[PDB]
């Protein structure tokens, strides 16, 4: 097989400089992901309904899209009646 030329993964993940850098970068990305949910930013970015944002106080009728081109406003008018 030989080796292509890049630095072997084995020696990198066993190097100190690597874990000096990645003992900060990896947890930060983890925390960043945590904050993306705990702040509730994920809900507003993707438009995913919160546990209290599926129905109104007295409806079981599914807010289903029935139109094609006016579908955007049809979803927006669903968000309004909440």
């Amino acid at each position: 097989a030989g080796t292509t030329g890049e630095r072997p993964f084995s020696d990198i993940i066993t190097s100190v400089r690597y874990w000096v850098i990645h003992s900060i970068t990896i947890p930060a990305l983890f925390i960043a992901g945590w904050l993306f949910v705990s702040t509730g930013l994920a809900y507003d970015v993707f438009g995913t309904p919160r546990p209290d944002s599926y129905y109104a106080q007295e409806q079981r009728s599914i807010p289903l899209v029935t139109d094609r081109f006016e579908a955007k406003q049809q979803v927006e008018t669903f968000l309004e009646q909440l």
Binding site: D52, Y54, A56, Q57, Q59, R60
Partner: protein, 137 residues
């Protein structure tokens, strides 16, 4: 949609008096229902007798009326037939027969109110799903 106090507000007796349960009280009545009722009463039906369900409309036409907290707690102490002609504690779990139904032993008076409440609150949330059967699954 949330668990508002008006949803948790259930009739107390048979003369109009009501009571608003708390959210934790409902979660307790849910946990206790799964503990000693769910085996025969999943979803408000009755596996060993599908002719009778835990629907509010059904409980109201029972004798004595069971569409309130006072009625259900009494049933959990001294259960009777739908017409109340005979007592059936010998074949139905109750405080009166907690010797042959051991799961009813550690149930306090507070525990009975929560269960009674959950039975009344649930159809106000699930609608006809409560006591409906596999059709409404």
């Amino acid at each position: 949609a949330e668990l508002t106090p008006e949803v948790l507000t259930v009739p107390l007796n048979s003369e109009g008096k009501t009571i608003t349960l708390t959210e934790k009280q409902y979660l307790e009545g849910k946990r206790l229902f799964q503990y000693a009722c769910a085996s025969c009463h999943v979803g408000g039906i009755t596996k060993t007798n599908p002719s009778l369900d835990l629907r509010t409309e059904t409980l109201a036409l029972a004798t004595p009326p069971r569409d309130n907290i006072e009625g259900l707690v009494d049933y959990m102490k001294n259960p009777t037939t739908y017409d109340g002609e005979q007592e059936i504690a010998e074949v139905h779990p109750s405080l009166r027969s907690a010797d042959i139904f051991p799961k009813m032993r550690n149930l306090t008076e507070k525990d009975l109110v929560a269960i009674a409440g959950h039975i009344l609150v649930e159809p106000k949330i699930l609608g006809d799903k409560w006591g409906g059967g596999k059709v409404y699954y």
